[PDB]
């Protein structure tokens, strides 16, 4: 009860108006601060115990940031637009050794979001669903998080069908990009742990904290 897509859209609009890997990691550290502000604007998130808020954000930050820059890049040709105002071209990612994962982002996320014209409200809800991940280990009350997630997709479905009555399978199409987002997010973490291990690639404090155990 009470999870209006209007509040979710507002959260979205409130937070967003040489080694490409280094530039991407810097943009990620910058956006981690903005991610906290976004979450705080998602209905009921701030009312959950502090430890569960931490758990949810540590569990979903990478997928949450990937979803955001991917949607921001729908207008971009063959690349992504970073929050720092910088653009990373597919050729540049390839020349830095991260071409495979970069292409997965363009192919499975950006292109698909562009193909269906995913809007900001839909993106917001999908992110709110990722945020409210009931499977997150350590949760003091997973049922509570599960209930919030259900309220989000219930509101998302109503939004769809009311806004896109001509596309009965839109709601399902949106949810079905989540497994790709999960797989891509996991691969990105692997790369990040490697960069950290190797020593090259400066990693800022907030991004570094997210890579800390557990």
């Amino acid at each position: 009860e009470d999870m209006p897509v209007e509040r979710i859209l507002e959260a979205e609009l409130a937070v967003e108006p040489n080694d490409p890997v280094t530039n991407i990691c810097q943009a990620a550290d910058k956006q981690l601060f903005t991610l906290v502000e976004w979450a705080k604007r998602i209905p009921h998130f701030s009312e959950l115990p502090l430890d569960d808020q931490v758990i949810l954000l540590r569990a979903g930050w990478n997928e949450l940031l990937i979803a955001s820059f991917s949607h921001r890049s729908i207008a971009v040709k063959d690349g992504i637009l970073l929050a720092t105002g910088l653009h990373v071209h597919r050729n540049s990612a390839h020349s830095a050794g991260v071409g495979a994962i970069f292409d997965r982002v363009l192919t499975e996320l950006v292109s698909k979001m562009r193909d269906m014209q995913m809007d900001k409200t839909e993106l917001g809800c999908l992110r709110a669903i990722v945020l409210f991940n009931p499977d997150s280990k350590g949760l003091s009350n997973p049922a509570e998080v599960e209930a919030l997630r259900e309220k989000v997709y219930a509101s998302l479905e109503a939004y769809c069908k009311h806004k896109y009555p001509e596309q009965p399978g839109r709601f399902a199409k949106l949810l079905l990009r989540l497994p790709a987002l999960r797989s891509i997010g996991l691969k990105c973490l692997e790369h990040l742990f490697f960069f950290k291990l190797i020593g090259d690639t400066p990693i800022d404090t907030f991004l570094m904290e997210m890579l800390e155990a557990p």
């Binding site: 601060f33 906290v36 705080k40 502090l50 808020q53 931490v54 954000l57 540590r58 404090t205 907030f206 904290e209 997210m210 800390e212």
Partner: peptide, 11 residues
């Protein structure tokens, strides 16, 4: 643990 995240969420 997780100094930054806790601080940012509390404020």
């Amino acid at each position: 643990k997780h100094k930054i995240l806790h601080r940012l969420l509390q404020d």
